[PDB]
Ligand binder design. Structure first.
Ligand code: OLC
Ligand code: OLC
Ligand code: OLC
Ligand code: OLC
Ligand code: OLC
Ligand code: OLC
Ligand code: OLC
Ligand code: OLC
Ligand code: OLC
Ligand code: OLC
Ligand code: OLC
Ligand code: OLC
Ligand code: OLC
Ligand code: OLC
Ligand code: OLC
Ligand code: OLC
Ligand code: RET
Ligand code: RET
Ligand code: RET
Ligand code: RET
Ligand code: RET
Ligand code: LFA
Ligand code: LFA
Ligand code: LFA
Ligand code: LFA
Ligand code: LFA
Ligand code: LFA
Ligand code: NA
Ligand code: NA
Ligand code: NA
Ligand code: NA
Ligand code: NA
Lengths: 269, 268, 268, 269, 269
C-alpha cells in the first residue's frame, strides 16, 4: 500500500529499475543542479556588462539559480536514497527507509521561480499599452494559482486519476492566462527597439513557449501512452526526469542568457 | 510509549503516523523556506549599493537575518525527514526515534538573532522624533529576548502539561504586546516629515509586521485551536503549523527587508 | 561500562540518560552558536570599508576568528547529536558509542586560532605608549598557548582523575592571569590620547573581555561547582556547561569584534 | 550475481575485489581531481582583472567549467567510496550494492557543460579570419553534443554487449574527428596577425588540446587495451582508467584555461 | 585479520585499539588543521590589495594552496572518525573496516598541488640574479613531483615491506635534497639588492622552509623512530605522526604565505 504517491514509487516497488534507468535518472538530476550552480556564477560575474537599469535582471536570474540549485540537489539525493540495488535480480527497488520519491519538491520551489522569471523581463522591455504593476500582479496571481493547483493534482496521479486530470485542467486555465499576458508583454517590448533586439525578443518568445509547455508534459508523462502504455514504465520515469531537466535549463538559464543579451544590445555601450 | 516533554508532532507520528501527503508537504514547505532564505541573502547582498551609505546597514542586517534563517530552516528540514520513517505494511510515516524526536525549539533560539536584528534595522531607515534611539533599541531587545525565552520554555509542554504551556504563552504574549506598542510608536514617528511615498511604504510595513508577527503565536497554539481532540489535533494541524511558520518567516524577514530597502531608496 | 578518560557528559548519558528537554536544548544552543558565528563572519566582511585602512586588519582578524568558530561549533553540534540516541522504553537519550564519546576538547585546540588572534587584533586599533608592540604580542601568544594546552590536557581527566584535572586547571589559570594583566596594560595605554567616547568604548571592551573570558574556566569547572554528587553533576550541569560556552563564545568573539569596530569608527 | 549493463569496475569489485592499493589510489586520484577543480575556480576568478575587458569572458567560462567539474568529481569520489566495502576475511574491497553500482556516466553528462564551453571560450581570445564565429560555434556545439551522447550510450554496454560498446564508440569518434578538424582551423586562423609569442602559445594550446582530448577515448577503451582477459582487465585497469581520467580533466580544463589566460595577457595592452 | 599493504594506524587500531585520549586528540588535531586552512584562505583573499600589483600573484597562489589543503584535511578528518569505532566492553576505539582502512596517501597526492605552488610563488616576490626563472621553476616542479610520487609508493609498505619503505624513502630524500639546494640558491639571490629588513625576512623564510619541510620525512619515519616494537610503534606514534603533519602543514603553508606577504609589503611602495 502506497496511497497518494508518485508513479515512480509504484514502478520501483513492482518491477524495479534497470541499471540504465536508475543511473540515467541520477545523472540527469546531477547535471541539472550543476547547471544551476554554474549559471549562478555566470550571472553574478556578468552583472557589470549591462547598464544599471538592467542589472535587476541579472540579480533575479541569480535568485532563480539559487532556488533551482538547492532544489535539484535535494531531489538528486532523494532519488538516490529512495531506490536500492537488489543483488538477486540486478534491479533497483523502492527502499522505504529512504522515503517515497515525490516530484512535489519542485512545485513549491516554482513558487519562487515562476513569479521571478515572469517578473525579470519587465526590467528589460518597455511596455506601451499595459501598466507595469497590472502586468506584474496578473503574472503573480496566475502563477501562484497554476503552481498550487498542479501541486495538489500531482499527488493523485496514481491513486485518483480523476482528481489528477481535473486539477491539471484548472491549472492549465491559469497557464493559458500567463501565456496571453506574456505574449502582450513581448509584443509591446518589440515596439521602438532595434531589429536585433526584436529578433532576440522573438527568440525569447519561442523559448518561453516551448520550455514552459514542457512542464505539463512531464505532469502527464506516465499516461501519454494511456493506461499500461509504453510510458507507464521505467521508460516513462526516465522521460519525465529528462523533460524536467531540459525544461529547467531552457526556462531558467538560457532564458536569463537571452535576457542578458537583450539588455546588452539595449544598453549604451 | 514514553515521550515526555515532546512536541505534538511526535505524538501524532507515534500513534496515527503521517500520510504521504502530510509528510511530503511538510518536507517540501521546509525546503522552500530555507531556499527562500538563501535567495534573499543573495538579493540583499547584491542590492547594497542601491541606497545611500547611511541606509546600507539595513541591507547588512537583512543579510545577517537571512544567514540565520537559512541555516536554521535547513537543519529543521533535515530534522523533519530524519524523525519519521515509512512503514510499508500500512503505508504511513511513523516516529523513528533513531533520528531523534522532532522539536520546534530550533526555530525559537534562532529568533534570538532574528527578532533583535529585525527590530533593530528599522531604526537605520526612519528618523525618530520624540523617542530616543537607544531607549527604543534597548526596549526592543529586552522584550524580544523575554518573549522568545518564555515561549521556548512553553513549547516543550504543549502536550505533557497544557497548563504550563498556556501560562508561558500568555507571559510571552505580554512582551509581544509591548513590542507591538513600541513598533507602533516607531512607525508613527518615522512617518513625520517624510515624503508621501515613504509614508505609504511605512503603512505597508506596519500592516505586514502586525500580521506576520501575529502568525507566530498562531502556530504556537495550532494543535489546540479546535480544542481537545479537535480537527487540528492531527496531521492536518502539523501541516498547518509548518505552513504558517513558513509564511510568517518569508513575510516577516524577506518581504520586510525588501520593503525597508524600497523605503530607503525613496528616502535617498 | 568502561569509559576511561572521557568527559562527564558521557557518564551522565550512559547512566541516567538525558531527558528530551536537556538533549534538545543542548542541540539548540550549539546550533545557535554556529549560526551566530556565520552571521558574524558576514557582518565583519561587509563592514570592512566602514573604517580607515589602518584599522581594517581588525575586521579581517575578526573574520578569521569567525571562520574558526563556525567550523568548530558546527562540528560539535553534529558530535552532540551523533553521540546520544533515544531509548523508546524509558524516553531518554543514552550514550550511543557508534557515534563516539562526546568530548569538549574540540573547542580547546580551536582556541589556538581564536585566542592568539583575538588578543592580536586589539593591537591594530589602540596605540600603545610605554609598551612595545612585539613584546605585548609575544606575551599574549605564549601565555595563551600555554593556558590552552594545559587546560586541554586537564579536561581529559575531569572524571577519571580529579587531581590531574584540578592541577592542570591551576597551571592554566596562572597563564590566564598573566594574559589579564597584559590586557589591562594594553587597554590603559590605549585610552591615553583618544577622545572620551573611545575611552568609554575601551572600558566596555575591558569589562566584556574580563567577564566573557572568565566564563571559560567556569565551564571547565561546571560539573563540580556544586561539589561531588551536586545538583550540577547531572544533565542540568551538561546544559549549563554548553550554555555558558555559547554565551562566552558569542561575547568574546562577535560582540568583542563589534565593539572594536565601533572604536575603530570613532578613531577614524 | 546479475549486474546487467554495468561498468567493468563493478564486475572486478564483485569477483576479485580490490587490494588496499587499488581502492586507496582510486579514491585519492578522484579526491585530487575535485580539489584541483575548486582551486582552479578560485584562480580563474581572482585573475579576471589581469586581461583586457574583451578577454574576460574566457575567465568566466573557465570558472563555469570549474564549477561543473568540481561538483561532478566530488559526487564521483563519494560514489567510489560508497560502492566498495572492506571484507575482513581476505583483506579486499568488494562490491557493496547498498552503495549503488559504480558508473562513469556521471562524467559524460557533465561533459555536456564542459565540452561546449571549453570549445566556446577560445573564440573570445583568438580572432577568426575567413570563418564565421556563429558557424564554428554551432559546429562545435552540435558535434560535441553528439559525441557525448553516443559515448554515454556506449559505455553502459562495455561488459554486457561489447559490440554495441564498440559501435557507439566509433560513432562518437567520428564527431570527435570533426571537432579536431574545426579546432585545427580555429588555431590556424588565430595564429594570423598576432605576435610570435602568441603564436607559440597557440601551438602549445593545440598540442595540449589534442593529447588531453585523445586521452578520453583511451579511458573509454582501457579495460580492453590488452585484449580479452588481458593484464588490464583487472584492478590495475580500474586504477589506470581513473588516473587517465584525472590527468585528462586537469589538462583539458585547468591548464587549457591557464594557457588561454596567458595568451589573453600577451594580446592585452 | 589480513590488512595487506596498509598504514600502521590500522594495525594499532586493529590489535590494541586507541584509548579515548589518542582517538580524540587525533580527531581534534585534524579538525584544527582544516579550520586553520580555511581561515588562511579568507586571510589571503582579503589582503590581496595590501601589496603592489606585481606581488599579488603570491597571494593568489597562497589562496590556491589553502583550498587544496582545506579539502584534503577535511576529508582526512572524516576518514579518521569513520575508520575507528568505540568498543563498549573494553573502552577503546578499534578498526572499523566498514569505514575503510585509514590511509595517509590522501595527503601525498594533494601535495602535487601544494609543493609546486609553494615553491613557485616565492619566484613572484624575489628577483633572481644568476639563476634563470624558467630553469628554477622546472627543477622545482620535476624534483617535487618525483619526491612526492616516490614517497607515496613507499608509504603503502611501511608495515608490509619495510625494505621497499626505506628504499622509496631514500629515493625521495635525494630529490628533497635537490629541492633544498635550489631553494637555498633562490633565497641567496633574492637577498641581493633589497633592504636589510627584506633580507632578514628572507632569512626567516629560509629557516621556516627548512624545518617545516624536513618535518614531513619525520612523519614518514615516525612509527620506527624508536626501532622495532619501540615506544612509537603504538597509539603514541599515531598521535605524534598526525601532530607532526599538522604542525608541518600550518608552518609550510600558512605561516610561509604570511611571511612572503610581509616581504612583498616591505618591497612595495
Ligand atoms: C478555474 C477557472 C478559472 C480560470 C481563470 C483564468 C484567468 C486568470 C485570471 C484573470 C484574473 C485577472 C488578474 C487578477 C489580478 C489580481
Ligand atoms: C480555481 C480553484 C478551484 C476551487 C474549487 C473546486 C475544486 C473542484 C475539483 C475537485 C477535486 C476532486 C474531484 O473529484 C474527484 C473524485 O473523488 C474522483 O472520484
Ligand atoms: C485545499 C485543497 C485540498 C483538496 C484535496 C482534495 C481534492 C482531491 O480529490 C481527491 C479526493 O479528495 C480523495 O479521493
Ligand atoms: C537545451 C539545453 C538543455 C539540454 C539538457 C540536456 C541533454 C540530455 C540528453 C541526454 C540523451 C540521453 C538519452 C538516454 O540514453 C539512454 C538510453 C539507453 O538505453
Ligand atoms: C538576549 C540577547 C539579546 C538581544 C541583544 C542582541 C545584541 C546584538 C549584538 C550587537 C552588540 O553591540 C551593540 C551595539 O553597541 C549597538 O550599537
Ligand atoms: C526555568 C523554568 C523551569 C520550568 C518549570 C516550569 C514549567 O514546567 C511545568 C511543570 O510545572 C513542571 O513539570
Ligand atoms: C516576568 C519574568 C518572568 C517569568 C516567571 C513566571 C513563572 C511562571 C510560573 C508558571 C510555570 O508553570 C507552572 C504551571 C503548571 O503547574
Ligand atoms: C607556571 C606559572 C608561570 C606562568 C605565569 C607567568 C608567566 C609568563 C612569564 C613572564 C614572561 C612572559 C612570557 C614569555 C614571552 O616573552 C616575551 C617577549 O620575549 C618580549 O619581547
Ligand atoms: C604532556 C604529556 C603529558 C602527561 C599528562 C598526564 C599528567 C597526569 C595525568 C593523570 C596521571 O595518569 C593518568 C591516570 O591513568 C588516570 O586515569
Ligand atoms: C553518424 C556518423 C557520423 C558522420 C560524421 C559526422 C562528423 C561531421 C558531421 C557533419 C558536418 C557539419 C555538422 C555540424 C554542422 C550542423 C549545424 C552547423 O551550422 C553551420 C552554419 C550555421 O550558421
Ligand atoms: C542536446 C543538449 C545539447 C547541450 C549542449 C549543446 C550546446 C548548448 C550549450 C549552450 C547554450 C548556452 C547559451 C546559448 C546562447 C549563447 C550564445 C547566444 O548569444
Ligand atoms: C598515461 C597512462 C599511465 C598508466 C596507464 C596504464 C597503461 C595505459 C594503456 C596502455 C597501452 C597498453 C599496451 C597495448 C599494446 C599491446 C596490446 C596487447 O595484446 C593484445 C593481446 O594480448
Ligand atoms: C606529475 C605532474 C605534476 C605537477 C608538476 C607541476 C605542474 C603544475 C603546473 C600548473 C599549470 O601549468 C601552468 C603552465 C606554466 O606556463
Ligand atoms: C615515476 C613517475 C613519472 C612522473 C613523470 C613526471 C613528473 C613531471 C612533473 C612536471 C615538471 C617537469 C617540468 C615542468 O614542465 C612545465 C613547463 O616548463 C611549463 O612551461
Ligand atoms: C612509477 C610507478 C611504479 C610502481 C612501483 C610498484 C611498487 C612496488 C615496490 O616494492 C614492492 C616490493 O614489495
Ligand atoms: C626518510 C627516508 C630515508 C631513509 C633512510 C635510509 C634507508 C637506507 C637505504 C635503504 C636500506 C634498507 C635497510 C633495510
Ligand atoms: C522553472 C520552472 C518553471 C518555468 C515552471 C513552469 C511551470 C508550468 C508551466 C506548470 C504547468 C502545469 C500545468 C499547466 C498543468 C499541470 C500542472 C503543472 C503545474 C505541471
Ligand atoms: C523571523 C521571526 C520572527 C519575526 C519571530 C517572531 C516571534 C514572535 C512573534 C513570537 C511569539 C510568541 C508569542 C507571542 C506567544 C506564544 C509564544 C511565541 C514565542 C510563539
Ligand atoms: C573564543 C575563545 C576564547 C576567548 C577562549 C578563552 C579561553 C580561556 C579563557 C581559557 C581558560 C582556561 C582556564 C583559565 C582554566 C581552566 C582551563 C581553561 C582552558 C578552560
Ligand atoms: C573536460 C572534459 C572533456 C574535454 C571531455 C572530452 C571528451 C571526449 C574527447 C570524449 C571522447 C569519446 C570518444 C572519442 C570515443 C568514445 C566515447 C568518448 C565519449 C569517451
Ligand atoms: C604542504 C605540504 C608540503 C610542503 C609537503 C612537503 C613534502 C615533503 C618535504 C616530502 C617529504 C618526503 C621525503 C623527503 C622522504 C619520505 C617521503 C616524503 C614523501 C614524506
Ligand atoms: C509549439 C508549442 C509546443 C511545443 C512542443 C511541446 C512538446 C511536448 C512533448 C511532451 C513530452 C514528450 C516526451 C516523450
Ligand atoms: C548598549 C547595548 C545595550 C543592550 C541592552 C539590551 C539587553 C538585552 C539582553 C536581555 C537579556 C535578558 C536576560 C534573560 C534572562 C532569562 C531568564 C529566564 C527566566 C526563566
Ligand atoms: C615572532 C613570533 C615569536 C613567537 C613568540 C612566542 C609565541 C609562540 C609560543 C608557542 C608556545 C608553544 C608551547 C607548547 C609547548 C609544549 C607544551 C607541552 C606541555 C607543557
Ligand atoms: C571535415 C573533416 C572531418 C571528417 C569528419 C567525419 C570523419 C569520419 C571518420 C570516422 C572514423 C571512425 C573511427 C574508427 C576507429 C577505428
Ligand atoms: C640515491 C640516488 C637515487 C637517484 C635519485 C637522484 C636524483 C635526484 C637529483 C637529480 C634531480
Ligand atoms: C622528527 C624529528 C625531525 C626534526 C627535524 C628538524 C629539522 C632539522 C633541520 C634544522
Ligand atoms: Na540507491
Ligand atoms: Na524519513
Ligand atoms: Na541523536
Ligand atoms: Na567503502
Ligand atoms: Na568513529
Amino acid at each position: 500500500e502506497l496511497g497518494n504517491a508518485n508513479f515512480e514509487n509504484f514502478i520501483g516497488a513492482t518491477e524495479g529499475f534497470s541499471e540504465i534507468a536508475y543511473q540515467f535518472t541520477s545523472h540527469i538530476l546531477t547535471l541539472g543542479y550543476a547547471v544551476m550552480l554554474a549559471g549562478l556564477l555566470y550571472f553574478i560575474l556578468t552583472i557589470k556588462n549591462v547598464d544599471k537599469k538592467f542589472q535587476m535582471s541579472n540579480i533575479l536570474s541569480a535568485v532563480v539559480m539559487v532556488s533551482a540549485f538547492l532544489l535539484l540537489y535535494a531531489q538528486a539525493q532523494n532519488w538516490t536514497s529512495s531506490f536500492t540495488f537488489n543483488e538477486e535480480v540486478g534491479r533497483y527497488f523502492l527502499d522505504p527507509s529512504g522515503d517515497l520519491f515525490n516530484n512535489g519538491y519542485r512545485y513549491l520551489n516554482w513558487l519562487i521561480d515562476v513569479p521571478m522569471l515572469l517578473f525579470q523581463i519587465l526590467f528589460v522591455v518597455s511596455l506601451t499599452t499595459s501598466k507595469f504593476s497590472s502586468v506584474r500582479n496578473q503574472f503573480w496571481f496566475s502563477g501562484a494559482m497554476m503552481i498550487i493547483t498542479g501541486y495538489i493534482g500531482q499527488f493523485y496521479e496514481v491513486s485518483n486519476l480523476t482528481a489528477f486530470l481535473v486539477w491539471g485542467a484548472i491549472s492549465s486555465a491559469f497557464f493559458f492566462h500567463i501565456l496571453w499576458v506574456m505574449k502582450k508583454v513581448i509584443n509591446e517590448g518589440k515596439e521602438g527597439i532595434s531589429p536585433a533586439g526584436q529578433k532576440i525578443l522573438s527568440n525569447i518568445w519561442i523559448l518561453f513557449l516551448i520550455s514552459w509547455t514542457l512542464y505539463p508534459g512531464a505532469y502527464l508523462m506516465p499516461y501519454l501512452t494511456g493506461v499500461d502504455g509504453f510510458l507507464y514504465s521505467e521508460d516513462g520515469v526516465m522521460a519525465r526526469q529528462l523533460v524536467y531537466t531540459i525544461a529547467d535549463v531552457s526556462s531558467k538559464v538560457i532564458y536569463g542568457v537571452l535576457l542578458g543579451n537583450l539588455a546588452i544590445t539595449l544598453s549604451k555601450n
